[PDB]
Nucleic acid binder design. Structure first.
Ligand code: CL
Ligand code: CL
Ligand code: CL
Ligand code: CL
Ligand code: CL
Ligand code: CL
Length: 276
DNA sequence: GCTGATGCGTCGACGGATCC
DNA sequence: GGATCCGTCGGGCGCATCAGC
């Protein structure tokens, strides 16, 4: 039940070469991840745009190593005001975005540090660290309300420029998206409510799941494994990290990768190749 | 300033019952 | 009586705060 991500496809269905490489990585403690050489892997991957989630780091505490990325020199960071040490997201880009914003409507009052929006010439990029439903589903109702607020927010944005949404969306959409579907239907990340919310997200905005679009029947493809019980060595995992795309961008889609071998978090990186 | 405790956030292994 | 279903329970990791020094 191990998994080998197939080779990188770097040309679109119409034969156009990839021009844009976006990497998304839920790093689960940015400072720890850097100590575990996460930036060395990033340099090898050489993305045009790097989106990070669960940084657990306010901007004043960013390691200096992050100042020595000449190919990712435009950097935007967010962290929650009243929950330091949790959430936190970042977006780093080769080229300067046209516009950058934070949160999903009222960040200035509910500084949550979970979402960054960056508008580029031909698309809008959103990265998100979606709220976990919590152990015992204690925060599932909050998650459901957040899912609705986020859908409404994104519908707004995609009504003008094509959208790319990436990050830790904290749900395995369908049974194929985790190793143990039967045992986890009452656990955060695989409740009927969260799965429904993801389906409504695809239909309402609308968006497509880039990986599943390309690999509709491929099992055992995950992006998260608990640190407990050696799960990663057994590939007992969940696909929690996505690139979701406006349908108008599917002709630009070259590939959507899962970088299973890259260590330094309990999530692995995912990478998108677009021909723009 | 430093270490290590505690707090907080964040499911697969296992044993036993049930299915035919 | 092997496969499957089901409920219980021990438990890695990062970071903030705190105690001790
Ligand atoms: Cl967190
Ligand atoms: Cl938010
Ligand atoms: Cl999907
Ligand atoms: Cl363990
Ligand atoms: Cl994915
Ligand atoms: Cl792939």
């Amino acid at each position: 039940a191990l998994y080998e991500d197939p080779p990188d496809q770097k040309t679109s269905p119409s034969g156009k070469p990839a021009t844009l490489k976006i990497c998304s990585w839920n790093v689960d403690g940015l400072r720890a991840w850097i100590k575990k050489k996460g930036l060395d892997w990033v340099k090898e991957e050489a993305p045009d745009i790097l989106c990070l989630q669960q940084t657990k780091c306010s901007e004043n505490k960013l390691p200096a190593e992050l100042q020595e990325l000449p190919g990712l020199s435009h950097q935007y960071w967010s962290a929650p005001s009243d929950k330091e040490g949790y959430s936190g997201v970042g977006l780093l880009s080769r080229q300067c975005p046209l516009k950058v914003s934070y949160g999903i409507g009222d960040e200035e009052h509910d500084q949550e540090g979970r979402v960054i929006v960056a508008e580029f010439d031909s698309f809008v990029l959103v990265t998100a660290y979606v709220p976990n439903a919590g152990r015992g589903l204690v925060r599932l109702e909050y998650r459901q309300r957040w899912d609705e607020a986020f859908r409404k927010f994104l519908k707004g944005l995609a009504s003008r420029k094509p959208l790319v949404l990436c990050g830790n969306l904290n749900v395995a959409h369908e049974e194929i998206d985790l190793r143990n579907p039967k045992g986890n239907k009452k656990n955060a990340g695989f409740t009927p409510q969260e799965r429904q919310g993801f389906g409504e997200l695809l239909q309402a905005v609308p968006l497509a799941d880039s990986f599943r679009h390309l690999y509709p029947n491929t099992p055992y493809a995950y992006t998260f494994w608990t640190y407990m019980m050696n799960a990663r060595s057994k590939n007992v995992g969940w696909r929690l990290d996505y690139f979701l795309l406006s349908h108008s961008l599917l002709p630009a889609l070259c590939d959507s990768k899962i970088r299973s071998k890259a260590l330094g978090s309990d999530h692995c990186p995912i990478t998108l190749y677009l021909a723009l």
